[PDB]
Design goal:
Subcellular location (chain A): Cytoplasm
Main location (chain A): cytoplasm
Order of helices and strands of chain D: HEEHEEEHEEHE
Radius of gyration of chain C: 13 Å
Largest sheet of chain C: 2 strands, antiparallel
Bound molecules: the ligand CO[C@H]1[C@@H](O)[C@H](O)[C@H](OC[C@@]23C[C@@H]4[C@H](C)CC[C@H]4[C@@]4(C=O)C[C@@H]2C[C@H](C(C)C)[C@@]34C(=O)O)O[C@@H]1C, guanosine-5'-diphosphate, magnesium ion
Radius of gyration of chain D: 23 Å
Number of helices of chain D: 4
Strand content of chain C: 5-15%
Distance between the termini of chain D: 32 Å
Largest sheet of chain D: 2 strands, antiparallel
Order of helices and strands of chain C: HEE
Helix content of chain C: 10-25%
Chains: A mainly alpha (94), B alpha+beta (824), C alpha+beta (52), D alpha+beta (189)
Family (chain A): Belongs to the universal ribosomal protein uL11 family.
Keywords (chain A): Cytoplasm, Isopeptide bond, Methylation, Phosphoprotein, Ribonucleoprotein, Ribosomal protein, RNA-binding, Ubl conjugation
Largest interface: B-D, 14 and 18 residues
Strand content of chain D: 5-15%
Structural class of chain C: alpha+beta
Protein name (chain A): Large ribosomal subunit protein uL11A
Oligomer: part of a larger assembly
Number of strands of chain D: 8
Strand order of the largest sheet of chain D: 1-8
RNA sequence: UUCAUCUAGACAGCCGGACGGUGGCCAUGGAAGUCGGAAUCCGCUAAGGAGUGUGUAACAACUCACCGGCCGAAUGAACUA
């Protein structure tokens, strides 16, 4: 699961525990990037990503705080790629 | 008021008629001179400039029967005993504060009007919160808020509102939930006021009852109609629950009107010399002048005017019996932490019930010394039972556990005495909850100690402080013909201060660890003029460094005899902290069976079982993290060499080649050794200097480095002052391990590894960086390797050994493996 | 004991400026010159050491 | 003037395809609420805030695309822009005259009305009591939670908001230095 | 001596927004725009820099870039002796 940039908002109603998942940019590169870019890189820096990803990242911006206010698929072709050094997909974003 | 020795003993038996407490104070807010006025006012006498030491001062409480008729506690009478200890001030002495809290049930809070509830107030306030002890607010120096400042009535109301509301925070955060309503609000008349340098004090509840007559409204609704949303109406004569009326005009709350307004008219009138209000307002508020009291003017006159209106004992000793808890209902939720042992146990249940004839329990927190040329007394509270002049009391030590001996001295008392601030009296007994002093227990116990009479009864709590003796300084003599006086003076400074700690240094100096510079320096001039009484030479405390290696030797070590015959070929490498730890901690012993000892070091420490069943020794002294692994096979006379090789090795691992000091993590793997044919060229004055010059080359080729000691200091302080502290690590290498806390308390316990070299004044700069708010908890953790070269008189490690070899009078240069190498 | 808003009012004419980096003197935090001759009307300043 | 020239061309293209527009004025907005109101109508009503590009639009109301620019042109005053749509007027009026929502106390902002506050609890832990400390208002410990002892009128009618007082005001959810995004003028066909 | 803003509407002044993904890749004892290096992208309008300083334990928060209000012509950056 999570290690760095994991913001999990806690809304408690007098003991009734329920934690919602804001699934940030690091959360998308783990729920899409299987065991290799998920765990095993604790003592070593994660800087490996280029291969095609597709439509699944458009619904990954849906888990990422949707405060953009216009188009989903459009804003993700920006967030995941230029800020993300692990996952390049289609060589056009940079 | 004088009371004979027996009148005290009769007063002592009545637990419902005896209040035992301390004084929760800041550095200087008015607690010493406030308590000084209660004695020359209503103080019990024997039968007929900073706080260095404290004692339980005694007084007499003679109240009215209808007064004790509103106290929620079991009580029968009005003949009470004031057993109050004058708790020490400022900081660094928070040592005797934890000790005054242990020998009492409540506490006298001494805050200020303008300097409200500062650091030391909430320090001793949060101290009483974790001791289940009850707090009672008393704002002193209210007169300075109307003399040097001259504050208005409604403005001075919100001045005390702030001091009070700031206490409602410290307490409603670190308090016990089984206590409930323990926060002091003048809404019940639990917060006092006054001036200690002028001899007076008052309460809202005093005039609530005093003016309950003049309004017909009882003292409970009179004072609940003074504070809060209660404003009187001098137009219609109605106490309305609002600041205005139908016209929308300004009202002065009942408090500032009927209470304060009267006192201000006294100031400017008396102080400024207006005899057009002196005898006038005298009779308007029911007061009288008499003799040479009429002949005084201004400053000295308004002093006597308060001694004519609200003297000391008035509001002070009044809230002492009315709201303060006596042992009866107090230890009825205190027993838990107060005694470290089974709660449903025999002696534990006796203290919650408080039986002054049953199970005798008496933990002496601090043994109070005297001018009796070195001998002291044992100041301790008698939880349950009665201590007599010559009783067989079980002197249990802080190490003792029910089932062994470990500091168990059950001896009879020489003589029994009473404590009166500075006066001792030859008495006999003292009951459950009351505190007394017993002579002779000292020559058996060590500083703090529990005293029982039952076998199944465990030990009573020995503090927890949460103050720690972080500081450390080297102490010696200025004349060796009186060095014997040096060690004996040091021994009495231990049974002198409860939070003080004396221990010997690894180098050969006498280390003095204190809470701070003030604390340490006081105990140094007291050890200078009293305890010892001889010239001392104090300089910064010298550290011991274990010479460690960081890789394998660049080539194979070579060294033979000066006579020239047999040679040594060893290859010294570094032992990992985990395996070198299993040596000094105890998982693989130097006297362990080589068969199964090697089995554990190969599958759990990752080694070759060959060289493992072949360990020659552990070192230095036979158990340190430096081994002699056997790796050769061409040695026919193996049984004639192992002995004296490890002989110069125990001198080599005990005396280092860099600056005459030991080593750490040095696993010497011997590849080959040229044997002879006879022990005449393989013996005593042969094998000693041979393995000596052999290990010199091995260490100077496997990477020379200096290793120093590391701390684990957890500084407890609120999140608001953390800024300055975090930067003191970014100052003297404070590498954070973790940072944990509770969901409802800001107070943060911060884990950070601290270097011995970067601690020669750590405590001073820490409270300076984030107020006294930073409480350091220093306790040694592990040995971390430096990273610099020791032969570099310019790198971290090299700088150290430069000044270190110049002090011993050794060689100015750092001799390498070239100097101690035997080659063709 | 001075009120946060009344404290900005105290700095408005005691320390909310810049110090000359030659002979030191009080000049606005936006001002970029010196009112002296010991330097010859210089441009050496710094936002007066924000003391904590 | 690269962008000044390309925007002139922009506004004209939308002003021709549609017949209904609104002169939406503001100044009391927020980066957040503004861009998020465009999300509300990402196909029904799109905003286009103009400027001296609208004094050029006086020379564009001079273009003669449909010269009814007379009853529109001079409504260029305050942070005002465009609102393009092709559906009924009262329907889209209800949508945009609901599309305006609150903004917090900017500690030192434009204080307009006198604020009152009931003597009850907020159910928070006593740590913010140090701010109510250097101001002066009694605070009770009910279940421990910070309780207001007075129905206090702290802020007066029209004054300079102090940094300290507007911070504990954000703790009570007080927001009057705002509006939202409304309108200055309307016009169809 | 240049450079390229500018009545189509700038600069000084002052009014109010100063976004989001995002506590961005990591790096993290702790770095959410504001210790560090490397990516310096588009969703969308009038704008919002993976962000200009102050400051936080990190946040928060304010303020600038940028952008709308009104003023309505200069007049500023960069160099010369
Ligand atoms: C609980 O109180 C503790 C803590 O304050 C801490 O553990 C303190 O540490 C003292 C030293 C402990 C080190 C290890 C145990 C190995 C090396 C020892 C030292 C020698 O250089 C380093 C620190 C400072 C002392 C030098 C100056 C001689 C030590 C010593 O007692 O020898 O000891 C007191 C009693
Ligand atoms: N302004 C003012 N000064 C006082 C008061 N009480 C004592 N002092 C002064 O404080 C001096 C010593 O105070 P101290 O006993 O050290 O205060 P403490 O450490 O809190 O007990 C006295 O000599 C007085 O002059 C008071 O009520 N008001
Ligand atoms: Mg004192």
């Amino acid at each position: 699961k999570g290690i760095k940039v994991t913001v999990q908002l806690k809304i408690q109603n007098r003991q009734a525990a329920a934690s919602v998942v804001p699934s940030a940019s690091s959360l998308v590169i783990t729920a899409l990037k299987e065991p290799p870019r998920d765990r095993k890189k604790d003592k070593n820096v994660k800087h490996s990503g280029n291969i095609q990803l597709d439509e699944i990242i458009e619904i990954a911006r849906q888990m990422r705080d949707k405060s953009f206010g216009r188009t989903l698929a459009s804003v993700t072709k920006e967030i995941l790629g230029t800020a993300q050094s692990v996952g390049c997909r289609v060589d056009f974003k940079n | 008021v004088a009371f004979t020795v027996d009148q005290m003993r009769s007063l002592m038996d009545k637990v419902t008629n005896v209040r035992n407490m301390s004084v929760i104070a800041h550095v200087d807010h008015g607690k010493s001179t406030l308590t000084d006025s209660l004695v020359q006012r209503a103080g019990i006498i024997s039968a007929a400039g900073i706080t260095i030491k404290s004692t339980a001062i005694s007084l007499y409480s003679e109240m009215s029967d209808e007064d004790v008729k509103e106290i929620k506690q079991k009580t029968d009478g009005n003949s009470f005993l004031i057993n109050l200890i004058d708790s020490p001030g400022h900081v660094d002495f928070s040592s005797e504060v934890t000790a005054a809290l242990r020998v009492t049930d409540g506490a006298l809070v001494v805050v200020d009007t303008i300097e409200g509830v500062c650091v030391q107030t909430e320090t001793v306030l949060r101290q009483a919160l974790g001791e289940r002890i009850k707090p009672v607010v008393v704002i002193n120096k209210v007169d300075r808020a109307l003399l040097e400042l001259q504050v208005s009535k409604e403005d001075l109301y919100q001045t005390f509102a702030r001091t009070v509301e700031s206490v409602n925070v410290i307490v409603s955060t670190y308090a016990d939930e089984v206590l409930g309503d323990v926060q002091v609000y003048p809404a019940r008349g639990t917060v006092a006021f006054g001036s200690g340098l002028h001899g007076w004090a008052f309460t809202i509840r005093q005039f609530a009852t005093r003016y309950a007559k003049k309004f017909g409204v009882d003292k409970a609704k009179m004072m609940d109609r003074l504070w809060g949303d209660s404003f009187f109406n001098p137009k219609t004569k109605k106490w309305t629950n609002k600041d205005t009326d139908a016209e929308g005009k300004p009202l002065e709350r009942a408090f500032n009107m009927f209470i304060l307004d009267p006192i201000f008219r006294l100031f400017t009138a008396i102080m400024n010399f207006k005899k057009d209000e002196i005898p006038v307002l005298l009779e308007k508020l029911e007061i009288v002048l008499k003799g040479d009291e009429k002949d005084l003017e201004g400053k000295a006159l308004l002093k006597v005017v308060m001694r004519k209106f609200l003297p000391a004992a008035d509001a002070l000793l009044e809230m002492i019996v009315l709201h303060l808890p006596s042992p009866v209902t107090a230890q009825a939720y205190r027993a838990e932490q107060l005694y470290e042992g089974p709660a449903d146990d025999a002696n534990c249940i006796a203290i919650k019930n408080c039986d002054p004839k049953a199970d005798l329990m008496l933990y002496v927190s601090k043994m109070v010394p005297t001018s009796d040329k070195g001998r002291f007394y044992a100041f301790g509270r008698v939880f349950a039972g009665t201590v007599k002049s010559g009783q067989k009391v079980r002197i249990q030590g802080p190490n003792y556990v029910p089932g062994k001996k470990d500091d168990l001295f059950i001896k009879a008392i020489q003589r029994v005495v009473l404590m009166m601030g500075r006066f001792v009296e030859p008495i006999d007994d003292c009951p459950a909850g009351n505190i007394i002093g017993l002579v002779g227990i000292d020559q058996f116990l060590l500083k703090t100690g529990t005293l029982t009479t039952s076998e199944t009864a465990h030990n009573m709590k020995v503090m927890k402080f949460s103050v720690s003796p972080v500081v450390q300084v080297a102490v010696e003599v200025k004349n060796a013909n009186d060095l014997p006086k040096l060690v004996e003076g040091l021994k009495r400074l231990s049974k002198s201060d409860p939070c003080v700690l004396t221990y010997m240094s690894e180098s050969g100096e006498h280390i003095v660890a204190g809470t701070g510079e003030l604390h340490l320096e006081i105990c140094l001039q007291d050890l200078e003029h009293d305890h010892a009484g001889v010239p001392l030479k104090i300089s910064p405390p010298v550290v011991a460094y274990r010479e460690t290696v960081e890789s394998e030797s660049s080539q194979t070590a070579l060294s033979k005899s000066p006579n020239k015959h047999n040679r040594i070929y060893l290859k010294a490498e570094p032992i990992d902290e985990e395996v070198s730890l299993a040596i000094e901690n105890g998982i693989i012993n130097p006297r362990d069976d080589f068969k199964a000892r090697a089995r554990i070091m190969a599958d759990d420490y990752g080694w070759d079982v060959t060289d493992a069943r072949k360990i020659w020794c552990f070192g230095p002294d036979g158990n340190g993290p430096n081994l002699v692994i056997d790796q050769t096979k061409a040695v026919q006379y193996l049984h004639e060499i192992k002995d004296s090789v490890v002989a110069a090795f125990q001198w080599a691992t005990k005396e280092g080649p860099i600056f005459g000091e030991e080593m750490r993590s040095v696993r010497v793997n011997i590849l080959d050794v040229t044997l002879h044919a006879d022990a005449i060229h393989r013996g005593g004055g042969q094998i000693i200097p041979t393995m000596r010059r052999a290990t010199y080359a091995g260490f100077l080729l496997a990477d020379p480095k200096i290793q120093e000691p590391v701390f684990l200091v957890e500084i407890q302080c609120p999140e608001q002052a953390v800024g300055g502290i975090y930067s003191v690590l970014n100052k003297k290498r404070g590498q954070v391990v973790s940072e944990e806390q509770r969901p409802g308390t800001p107070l943060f316990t911060v884990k950070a590894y601290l270097p011995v070299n970067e601690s020669f004044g750590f405590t001073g700069e820490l409270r300076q960086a984030t107020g006294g708010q930073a409480f350091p908890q220093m306790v040694f953790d592990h040995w971390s390797t430096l990273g610099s070269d020791p032969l570099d008189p310019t790198s971290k490690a090299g700088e150290i050994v430069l000044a270190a070899r110049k002090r011993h009078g050794m060689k100015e240069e750092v001799p390498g493996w070239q100097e101690y190498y035997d080659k063709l | 004991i001075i009120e946060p808003s009344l404290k900005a009012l105290a700095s408005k004419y005691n320390c909310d400026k810049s110090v000359c980096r030659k002979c030191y003197a009080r000049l606005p935090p936006r001002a970029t010159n010196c009112r002296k001759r010991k330097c010859g009307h210089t441009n050496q300043l710094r936002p007066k050491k924000k003391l904590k | 003037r690269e962008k000044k020239a390309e925007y002139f061309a922009k506004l004209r293209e939308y002003l021709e395809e549609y017949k209904s527009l609104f002169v939406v004025g503001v100044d009391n907005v927020s980066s957040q609420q503004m861009h998020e109101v465009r999300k509300e109508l990402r196909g029904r009503a799109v905003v286009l805030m103009g400027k001296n590009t609208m004094v050029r639009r006086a020379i564009r109301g001079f273009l003669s695309d449909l010269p009814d620019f007379e009853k529109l042109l001079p409504f260029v005053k305050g942070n005002v822009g465009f609102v393009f749509t092709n559906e009924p007027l009262t329907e889209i009026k209800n949508v945009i005259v609901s599309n305006r929502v609150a903004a917090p106390a900017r500690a030192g902002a434009v204080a307009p009305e006198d604020i009152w506050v009931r003597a009850v609890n907020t159910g928070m832990e006593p740590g913010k009591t140090s701010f109510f400390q250097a101001l002066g208002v009694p605070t009770k410990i009910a279940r421990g939670t910070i309780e207001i002892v007075s129905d206090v009128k702290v802020v007066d009618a029209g004054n300079k908001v102090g940094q300290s007082e507007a911070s504990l005001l954000n703790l009570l959810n007080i927001s009057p230095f705002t509006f939202g995004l409304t309108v200055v003028q309307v016009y169809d066909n």
